Amino acid sequence: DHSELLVNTKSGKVMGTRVPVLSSHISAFLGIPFAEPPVGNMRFRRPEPKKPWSGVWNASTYPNNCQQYVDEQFPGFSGSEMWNPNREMSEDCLYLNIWVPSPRPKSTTVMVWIYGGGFYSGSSTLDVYNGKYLAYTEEVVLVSLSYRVGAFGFLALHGSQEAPGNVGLLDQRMALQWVHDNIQFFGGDPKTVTIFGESAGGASVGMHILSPGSRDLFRRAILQSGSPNCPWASVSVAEGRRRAVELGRNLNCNLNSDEELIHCLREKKPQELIDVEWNVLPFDSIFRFSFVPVIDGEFFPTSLESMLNSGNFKKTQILLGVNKDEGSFFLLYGAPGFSKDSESKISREDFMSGVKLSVPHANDLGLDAVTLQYTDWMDDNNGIKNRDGLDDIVGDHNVICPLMHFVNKYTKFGNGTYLYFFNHRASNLVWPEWMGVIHGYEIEFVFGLPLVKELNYTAEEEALSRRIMHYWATFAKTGNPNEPHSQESKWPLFTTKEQKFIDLNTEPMKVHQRLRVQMCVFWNQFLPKLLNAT
Amino acid sequence: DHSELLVNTKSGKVMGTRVPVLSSHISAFLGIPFAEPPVGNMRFRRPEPKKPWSGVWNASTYPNNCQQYVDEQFPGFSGSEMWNPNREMSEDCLYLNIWVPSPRPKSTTVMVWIYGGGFYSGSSTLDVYNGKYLAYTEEVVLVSLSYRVGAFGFLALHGSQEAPGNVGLLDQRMALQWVHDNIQFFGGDPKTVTIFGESAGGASVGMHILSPGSRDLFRRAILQSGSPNCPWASVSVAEGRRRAVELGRNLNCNLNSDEELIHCLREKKPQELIDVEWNVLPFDSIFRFSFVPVIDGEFFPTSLESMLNSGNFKKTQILLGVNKDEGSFFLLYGAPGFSKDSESKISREDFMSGVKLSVPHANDLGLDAVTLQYTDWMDDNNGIKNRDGLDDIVGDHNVICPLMHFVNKYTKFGNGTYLYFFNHRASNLVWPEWMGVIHGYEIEFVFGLPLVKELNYTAEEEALSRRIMHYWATFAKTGNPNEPHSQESKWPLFTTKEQKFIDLNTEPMKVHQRLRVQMCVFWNQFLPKLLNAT
Ligand SMILES: *[C@@H]1O[C@H](CO)[C@@H](O[C@@H]2O[C@H](CO)[C@@H](O)[C@H](O)[C@H]2NC(C)=O)[C@H](O)[C@H]1NC(C)=O
Ligand SMILES: *[C@@H]1O[C@H](CO)[C@@H](O[C@@H]2O[C@H](CO)[C@@H](O)[C@H](O)[C@H]2NC(C)=O)[C@H](O)[C@H]1NC(C)=O
Ligand SMILES: *[C@@H]1O[C@H](CO)[C@@H](O)[C@H](O)[C@H]1NC(C)=O
Ligand SMILES: *[C@@H]1O[C@H](CO)[C@@H](O)[C@H](O)[C@H]1NC(C)=O
Ligand SMILES: C[C@@]12CCN[C@@H]1Nc1ccc(O)cc12
Ligand SMILES: C[C@@]12CCN[C@@H]1Nc1ccc(O)cc12
Ligand SMILES: [Cl-]
Ligand SMILES: [Cl-]
Ligand SMILES: [Cl-]
Ligand SMILES: [Cl-]
Ligand SMILES: [Cl-]
Ligand SMILES: [Cl-]
Ligand SMILES: [Cl-]
Ligand SMILES: [Cl-]
Ligand SMILES: [Cl-]
Ligand SMILES: [Cl-]
Ligand SMILES: [Cl-]
Ligand SMILES: [Cl-]
Ligand SMILES: [Cl-]
Ligand SMILES: [Cl-]
Ligand SMILES: [Cl-]
Ligand SMILES: [Cl-]
Ligand SMILES: [Cl-]
Ligand SMILES: [Cl-]
Ligand SMILES: [Cl-]
Ligand SMILES: [Cl-]
Ligand SMILES: [Cl-]
Ligand SMILES: [Cl-]
């Protein structure tokens, strides 16, 4: 072993690059391969382990981003473009990135990031995901993986082995297997790996907790604005098949057999599958994505609900939470009456159009039930109330209530739960005020962007980012976000009985209980009973 | 014409009695017959007009009270005994009472009182109904009628003419016909008659507004805590028949034909029918009575809802309202966990037992819907919240929301609506504090008991009674409760658009809007759609 930027792993030697960070420096090994390129006849198939290489792998520059739908609703606007691929797109995209403190640690806490983006998009190379601030400030080895999204990672024709489904989840598991096998050479302790992600990434984290084939590969888990049981996170095998066939029908494919269909889908260039991706959804809806995990009986033994009830899952500690206005993004992009440069005050007619779009699987009784629940009939024509009420409908149904069901089911068997409610609106936010604390905007605090002066955050925001980075890192390290024997206020543990949680903002810590119970009893207990009876 | 206490009517001469009232005096003609005694083969039949008499009728003492169930839940307790018959009970009970100012007016405003008591009880002779205070203070001719209740006034075997149903309503209409024909001789103006009643009496008033055969007999209407469309106020002809047959089955009657059944029921003494009256209800329930008006296609042309929608009803002015805690009486008497001498804090189990009892016709989804709606899940085990929530369930479902539906349907076609919310708890109340402002306790203010010193009301309460007596009387007289060109605050008119109403207490008048819309949209629009779909 010669240099600090050279590391010999079980797959071959890797050469990194020194990176500047807050007046200091650390090491980064970017673009390390963990699977063979899922190209050609490999498209839609399970990932294959990367064949070991001779010589030295150049790990000094980020890798390609997986083929995905690109958002151009607001061309040039940073608010939306900070999420788009910032590297060239390619089906050859299964790589991982590692940020190592300097000098190289011997056996320190490890954190693996799993990006979100509704399983149809996402990149490990985004600026808000730069792990050098976290690695540096908290001295953890920070890993960020990648995984096939869209049809590429989730086209599902159950029964077939050419496109069984969930391969994007299997891509994640292989990156986690590689971390388990090689993170030691980078100074990481494979027995103290914490996986964390946001949105589809948080749902993924929860899916690795559930899937028996993934449990042994990590120690602890953090989930941000995502839960495995989210209504948009999975589909039955019948629906997945139905959508795969419909995708084929959009490309004038032969539909006589799975082989015919799959072969045809494999002959198409990437952008061709992406171009008709959204045409397969079964309803006019928001917060619904075409290709997602399928409850196959393999990666997922049984229905998610029976697994949560039987305690059929990994038991450990978890730290999770949600943002105050999870729904605003999805209404801005597809609900009538909402627009980026307007206060978007909503009319009674658009409110109702929005309820229909938000609970696509509901019948009329169900739609009325929802409307009754979120309408102030003492002032039903208040455009701001209609807007905010619709925002909460989308956030409660799609993120918060599903996470609260998961939190409650998990706590009965887990070894420690820490729940947070993130409600701070960034001072340099480019989105309109009506969107509030947006889906995905706690991430910048988790990765420490506020400590970077040029980004223009207030001093209190830098403080908030530090507390957060330290809660996350201390939790990953010990199973508890609080410092042992500290003076600071204690984030209390979430219990079945007390159900406490804390707010996460620039104000002095404050503890609360039963996060949105009223609305969540509606969403998790009532509405489903109603839909199953009618 | 010789004396002030002697009056010659179209039915014969009547002799009254001078009565003392607040240091002064007035005349009272008590026990005037308006129908032939519905005795013997007359039981269950339509009322027959009283055959004119020779000589002078002694109208100096109250008449008998109709045969009815007598309440002995709290023997000796005034709170419950002030509602029980205070005269001997008899099937010979169709009489009316008149209080005439002195000196006798020539043609003044007339008010006719229709007592309540769920159509199974009630008397025109109760102390809280003494009309001398109102007649005196407001100089109106005050009439109080009587009508058969229980099986006697509402046994219904549609198709038959021996017991067609609604005869108790027909008893009321005949008393109103007699007032139309003879009130002139007592100084009353038959063209300015206002009918008013509480509970079943208020529902009756609304039924006379609906029934084309009753409309021409009165000018205006006042309804207190009752509405024709209340869930307990009527039954289909099938259900009435079903209950009449079940009553017969309780007395070991022959059930082969209506004639057999009716003849048998006619051979039984009164107390025998009363003794098994409650055994015919179809569900374990509260706020439900055995024999009530039937939607027969005669007195009621069509369903109450289609009549309200088509505007098929008398168009005039109406003044109506409800009390703050309508449900407490019915929970005290039959819901588990409630008792007279306890604070009655309710357990989650009794709350649920109570929901079942309160919405007897509901399936499980419906029961859950109700529970979800009235449960504070942030503190579901608060015994006081469970108690009060259950109180509102009973009041909203049985009185307030049905009245608000009626108010809204009526206003689209009426000539003026005045709505009130009575929320003052009497200072000398003998019932426990948890019952609040009880069903039936605004009556004592409407009849002016507070002006009687010996009854122990505060000075402010005497003031409240006077404003109320004067709103009622001024409304009966002109169609508007407000004084023309007055300094006092104005009770605004209730409109389809603004929906304003006022509170009625000892505080300075205050106007509000949309009385209990949130809960009433639930009860009037949502729940029924839910029950009709499931
Ligand atoms: C997490 O699991 C640990 C170990 O399974 C729990 O610690 C045990 O707690 C019981 C009760 O105090 C003791 O009898 C054992 O000796 C403990 N083991 C050790 C090594 O500490 C711990 O209580 C669990 N924590 C939570 C929040 O459930
Ligand atoms: C109650 O009815 C009366 C009479 O039908 C209404 O009075 C009429 O109002 C219109 C509009 O102002 C006038 O053109 C008529 O000349 C009025 N008639 C009389 C004799 O006043 C009155 O508006 C109605 N009130 C309510 C509250 O609906
Ligand atoms: C590593 O590869 C990148 C590819 O563009 C190149 O820019 C860089 O100079 C290379 N470094 C070495 C030592 O190969
Ligand atoms: C009227 O009848 C009642 C019946 O008890 C009696 O007390 C009263 O004295 C009678 N008066 C006359 C004049 O008949
Ligand atoms: C990761 C993000 C945050 C918002 N921008 C990115 N795009 C997207 C789409 C869906 C989702 O749930 C989450 C996301
Ligand atoms: C008239 C009263 C007021 C409470 N005491 C009398 N009894 C009774 C029963 C039912 C009802 O709706 C109303 C009543
Ligand atoms: Cl920097
Ligand atoms: Cl779903
Ligand atoms: Cl096929
Ligand atoms: Cl489709
Ligand atoms: Cl859309
Ligand atoms: Cl739950
Ligand atoms: Cl929950
Ligand atoms: Cl921003
Ligand atoms: Cl802005
Ligand atoms: Cl930023
Ligand atoms: Cl909940
Ligand atoms: Cl007196
Ligand atoms: Cl009903
Ligand atoms: Cl019969
Ligand atoms: Cl029965
Ligand atoms: Cl009962
Ligand atoms: Cl209504
Ligand atoms: Cl209404
Ligand atoms: Cl009292
Ligand atoms: Cl008391
Ligand atoms: Cl009294
Ligand atoms: Cl309403």
CSV table of C-alpha atoms in Angstrom, one decimal, chain A residues 238-477:
chain,number,residue,atom,x,y,z
A,238,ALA,CA,-50.9,-8.3,-12.3
A,239,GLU,CA,-50.6,-4.5,-12.6
A,240,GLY,CA,-46.9,-4.6,-13.3
A,241,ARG,CA,-47.6,-7.1,-16.1
A,242,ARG,CA,-50.5,-5.0,-17.4
A,243,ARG,CA,-48.2,-1.9,-17.6
A,244,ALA,CA,-45.3,-3.8,-19.2
A,245,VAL,CA,-47.7,-5.1,-21.9
A,246,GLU,CA,-49.1,-1.5,-22.3
A,247,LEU,CA,-45.6,-0.1,-22.7
A,248,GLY,CA,-45.1,-2.7,-25.5
A,249,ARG,CA,-48.4,-1.7,-27.1
A,250,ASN,CA,-47.1,1.9,-27.2
A,251,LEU,CA,-44.0,0.8,-29.2
A,252,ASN,CA,-46.0,-1.4,-31.6
A,253,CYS,CA,-44.4,-4.5,-30.1
A,254,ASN,CA,-45.5,-8.1,-30.8
A,255,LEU,CA,-47.6,-9.0,-27.7
A,256,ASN,CA,-48.1,-12.8,-28.3
A,257,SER,CA,-45.7,-13.9,-25.6
A,258,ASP,CA,-43.3,-12.5,-22.9
A,259,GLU,CA,-40.3,-13.5,-25.1
A,260,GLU,CA,-41.8,-11.6,-28.0
A,261,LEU,CA,-42.5,-8.5,-25.9
A,262,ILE,CA,-39.2,-8.5,-24.0
A,263,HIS,CA,-37.1,-9.0,-27.2
A,264,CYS,CA,-39.0,-6.1,-28.8
A,265,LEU,CA,-38.5,-3.8,-25.8
A,266,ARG,CA,-34.8,-4.7,-25.8
A,267,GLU,CA,-34.4,-3.6,-29.5
A,268,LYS,CA,-35.6,-0.1,-28.7
A,269,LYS,CA,-33.2,2.7,-27.8
A,270,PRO,CA,-33.5,4.1,-24.3
A,271,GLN,CA,-35.3,7.4,-25.1
A,272,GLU,CA,-38.0,5.4,-26.9
A,273,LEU,CA,-39.1,3.7,-23.7
A,274,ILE,CA,-38.8,6.9,-21.8
A,275,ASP,CA,-40.9,8.8,-24.4
A,276,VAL,CA,-44.0,6.7,-23.7
A,277,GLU,CA,-43.4,5.8,-20.1
A,278,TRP,CA,-46.1,7.9,-18.6
A,279,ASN,CA,-48.7,6.5,-21.0
A,280,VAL,CA,-49.1,3.3,-19.0
A,281,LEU,CA,-50.6,4.7,-15.7
A,282,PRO,CA,-54.1,3.3,-15.1
A,283,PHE,CA,-55.6,6.6,-13.9
A,284,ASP,CA,-55.3,10.3,-14.4
A,285,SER,CA,-53.3,11.0,-11.2
A,286,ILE,CA,-50.5,12.8,-9.4
A,287,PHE,CA,-47.9,11.1,-7.3
A,288,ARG,CA,-48.1,7.9,-9.3
A,289,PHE,CA,-45.2,6.4,-11.3
A,290,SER,CA,-45.2,3.8,-14.0
A,291,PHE,CA,-42.5,1.3,-13.1
A,292,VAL,CA,-42.1,0.5,-9.5
A,293,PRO,CA,-41.4,-2.5,-7.2
A,294,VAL,CA,-43.8,-5.4,-7.5
A,295,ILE,CA,-45.0,-7.6,-4.7
A,296,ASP,CA,-43.5,-10.8,-6.3
A,297,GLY,CA,-43.4,-13.3,-3.5
A,298,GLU,CA,-39.6,-13.4,-3.8
A,299,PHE,CA,-37.9,-10.1,-2.8
A,300,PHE,CA,-41.1,-9.6,-0.9
A,301,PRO,CA,-42.3,-12.9,0.6
A,302,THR,CA,-45.8,-11.8,1.2
A,303,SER,CA,-47.9,-8.5,1.1
A,304,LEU,CA,-46.2,-5.6,2.9
A,305,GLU,CA,-49.1,-5.4,5.3
A,306,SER,CA,-48.9,-9.0,6.5
A,307,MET,CA,-45.1,-8.7,6.9
A,308,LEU,CA,-45.5,-5.6,9.0
A,309,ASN,CA,-48.2,-7.3,11.1
A,310,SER,CA,-46.3,-10.5,11.7
A,311,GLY,CA,-43.1,-8.7,12.5
A,312,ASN,CA,-41.5,-10.3,9.5
A,313,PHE,CA,-38.7,-7.8,9.1
A,314,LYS,CA,-35.2,-6.7,10.3
A,315,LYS,CA,-35.4,-5.5,13.9
A,316,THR,CA,-32.9,-2.7,14.7
A,317,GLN,CA,-33.0,1.1,15.3
A,318,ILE,CA,-34.5,3.5,12.7
A,319,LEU,CA,-34.6,7.3,12.4
A,320,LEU,CA,-37.3,8.7,10.1
A,321,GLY,CA,-39.5,11.7,9.4
A,322,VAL,CA,-41.4,13.9,7.0
A,323,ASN,CA,-41.4,17.6,5.8
A,324,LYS,CA,-44.4,19.9,6.4
A,325,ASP,CA,-45.5,20.3,2.8
A,326,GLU,CA,-44.7,17.1,0.9
A,327,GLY,CA,-47.6,17.6,-1.6
A,328,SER,CA,-46.9,21.0,-3.1
A,329,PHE,CA,-44.4,19.7,-5.8
A,330,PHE,CA,-46.9,17.2,-7.2
A,331,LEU,CA,-49.8,19.7,-7.4
A,332,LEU,CA,-47.6,22.4,-9.0
A,333,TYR,CA,-46.6,19.9,-11.7
A,334,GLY,CA,-50.0,18.5,-12.5
A,335,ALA,CA,-53.0,19.8,-10.7
A,336,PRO,CA,-55.1,22.5,-12.3
A,337,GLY,CA,-55.0,26.0,-10.8
A,338,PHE,CA,-51.4,25.7,-9.5
A,339,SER,CA,-48.5,27.5,-11.1
A,340,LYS,CA,-45.0,28.5,-10.3
A,341,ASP,CA,-45.3,32.2,-10.4
A,342,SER,CA,-48.8,32.5,-8.9
A,343,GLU,CA,-50.0,32.4,-5.2
A,344,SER,CA,-52.1,29.6,-6.7
A,345,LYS,CA,-55.3,30.3,-4.7
A,346,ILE,CA,-57.6,27.5,-5.7
A,347,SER,CA,-61.3,27.6,-6.7
A,348,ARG,CA,-63.8,25.1,-5.4
A,349,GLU,CA,-63.8,23.4,-8.8
A,350,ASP,CA,-60.1,22.9,-9.1
A,351,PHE,CA,-60.0,21.7,-5.5
A,352,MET,CA,-62.4,18.9,-6.5
A,353,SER,CA,-60.4,18.3,-9.7
A,354,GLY,CA,-57.4,17.9,-7.4
A,355,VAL,CA,-59.0,15.4,-5.0
A,356,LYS,CA,-59.9,13.2,-8.0
A,357,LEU,CA,-56.2,13.4,-9.1
A,358,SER,CA,-54.9,12.7,-5.7
A,359,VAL,CA,-56.9,9.6,-4.8
A,360,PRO,CA,-57.2,8.0,-8.3
A,361,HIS,CA,-58.2,4.6,-7.0
A,362,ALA,CA,-61.2,6.1,-5.1
A,363,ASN,CA,-64.9,5.9,-6.0
A,364,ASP,CA,-67.2,8.8,-5.5
A,365,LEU,CA,-68.1,8.0,-1.9
A,366,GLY,CA,-64.4,8.0,-1.2
A,367,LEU,CA,-63.8,11.3,-3.0
A,368,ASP,CA,-66.6,12.9,-1.0
A,369,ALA,CA,-65.2,11.4,2.2
A,370,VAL,CA,-61.8,13.0,1.4
A,371,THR,CA,-63.4,16.4,0.4
A,372,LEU,CA,-65.6,16.5,3.6
A,373,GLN,CA,-62.4,15.8,5.6
A,374,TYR,CA,-60.4,18.6,4.2
A,375,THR,CA,-63.0,21.3,3.6
A,376,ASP,CA,-63.7,24.1,6.1
A,377,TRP,CA,-67.5,24.4,5.3
A,378,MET,CA,-67.6,27.7,7.3
A,379,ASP,CA,-65.5,29.2,4.5
A,380,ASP,CA,-65.5,26.7,1.6
A,381,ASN,CA,-64.7,29.4,-0.9
A,382,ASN,CA,-61.4,30.5,0.6
A,383,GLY,CA,-58.8,30.0,-2.2
A,384,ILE,CA,-55.9,29.8,0.2
A,385,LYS,CA,-57.6,27.2,2.4
A,386,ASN,CA,-58.5,25.2,-0.7
A,387,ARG,CA,-54.9,25.3,-1.8
A,388,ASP,CA,-53.4,24.4,1.6
A,389,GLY,CA,-56.0,21.7,2.2
A,390,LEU,CA,-55.2,20.1,-1.2
A,391,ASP,CA,-51.5,20.3,-0.3
A,392,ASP,CA,-52.1,18.3,2.9
A,393,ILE,CA,-54.3,15.8,1.1
A,394,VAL,CA,-51.4,14.9,-1.2
A,395,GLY,CA,-48.8,14.9,1.6
A,396,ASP,CA,-50.9,13.0,4.1
A,397,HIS,CA,-52.1,10.3,1.7
A,398,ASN,CA,-48.7,9.8,-0.1
A,399,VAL,CA,-46.1,10.3,2.5
A,400,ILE,CA,-47.0,11.1,6.2
A,401,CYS,CA,-49.8,8.7,6.9
A,402,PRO,CA,-48.1,5.8,5.2
A,403,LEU,CA,-44.9,6.5,7.1
A,404,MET,CA,-46.9,6.8,10.4
A,405,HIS,CA,-48.5,3.4,9.8
A,406,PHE,CA,-45.0,2.0,9.1
A,407,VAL,CA,-43.6,3.7,12.2
A,408,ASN,CA,-46.3,2.3,14.4
A,409,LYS,CA,-46.1,-1.2,13.0
A,410,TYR,CA,-42.3,-1.2,13.2
A,411,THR,CA,-42.0,0.1,16.7
A,412,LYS,CA,-43.9,-2.9,18.2
A,413,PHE,CA,-40.9,-5.0,17.2
A,414,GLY,CA,-38.0,-2.7,16.6
A,415,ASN,CA,-35.1,-1.8,18.9
A,416,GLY,CA,-35.6,2.0,18.8
A,417,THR,CA,-37.4,4.6,16.8
A,418,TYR,CA,-36.6,8.3,16.4
A,419,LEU,CA,-39.2,10.4,14.6
A,420,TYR,CA,-38.9,14.0,13.2
A,421,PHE,CA,-41.1,16.6,11.6
A,422,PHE,CA,-39.0,18.9,9.3
A,423,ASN,CA,-40.7,22.3,9.0
A,424,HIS,CA,-38.1,25.0,8.2
A,425,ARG,CA,-38.4,27.0,5.0
A,426,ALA,CA,-35.0,27.8,3.6
A,427,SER,CA,-34.2,31.5,3.3
A,428,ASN,CA,-32.7,31.2,-0.2
A,429,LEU,CA,-35.5,29.1,-1.6
A,430,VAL,CA,-36.3,29.7,-5.3
A,431,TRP,CA,-39.7,28.2,-5.2
A,432,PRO,CA,-42.8,30.2,-4.4
A,433,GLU,CA,-43.9,30.7,-0.8
A,434,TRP,CA,-47.1,28.7,-1.3
A,435,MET,CA,-45.2,25.5,-1.7
A,436,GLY,CA,-43.9,25.8,1.9
A,437,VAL,CA,-41.4,23.2,3.1
A,438,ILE,CA,-41.0,21.1,-0.1
A,439,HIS,CA,-40.6,17.4,-0.7
A,440,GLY,CA,-36.8,16.9,-1.0
A,441,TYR,CA,-35.7,20.1,0.7
A,442,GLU,CA,-34.5,18.7,4.0
A,443,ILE,CA,-31.8,16.9,2.0
A,444,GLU,CA,-29.6,20.0,1.6
A,445,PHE,CA,-29.5,20.2,5.4
A,446,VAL,CA,-28.7,16.6,5.8
A,447,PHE,CA,-25.7,17.0,3.4
A,448,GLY,CA,-24.5,20.2,4.9
A,449,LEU,CA,-24.9,22.7,2.1
A,450,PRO,CA,-25.7,25.5,4.6
A,451,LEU,CA,-22.0,25.4,5.8
A,452,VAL,CA,-21.0,26.6,2.4
A,453,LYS,CA,-21.0,30.4,2.6
A,454,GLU,CA,-21.4,31.0,-1.2
A,455,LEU,CA,-24.7,29.3,-1.1
A,456,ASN,CA,-26.2,32.1,1.0
A,457,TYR,CA,-27.9,30.4,4.0
A,458,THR,CA,-28.4,32.3,7.3
A,459,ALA,CA,-26.2,31.6,10.3
A,460,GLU,CA,-29.0,29.9,12.1
A,461,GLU,CA,-29.5,27.6,9.1
A,462,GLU,CA,-25.9,26.6,9.2
A,463,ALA,CA,-26.5,25.7,12.9
A,464,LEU,CA,-29.5,23.6,12.0
A,465,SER,CA,-27.6,21.7,9.3
A,466,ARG,CA,-24.9,20.9,11.8
A,467,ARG,CA,-27.3,19.6,14.4
A,468,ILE,CA,-28.9,17.5,11.7
A,469,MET,CA,-25.7,16.1,10.3
A,470,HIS,CA,-24.7,15.3,13.8
A,471,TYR,CA,-28.0,13.6,14.8
A,472,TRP,CA,-27.8,11.5,11.6
A,473,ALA,CA,-24.1,10.6,12.1
A,474,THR,CA,-24.4,9.9,15.9
A,475,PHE,CA,-27.4,7.8,15.2
A,476,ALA,CA,-25.6,5.8,12.5
A,477,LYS,CA,-22.7,5.4,14.9
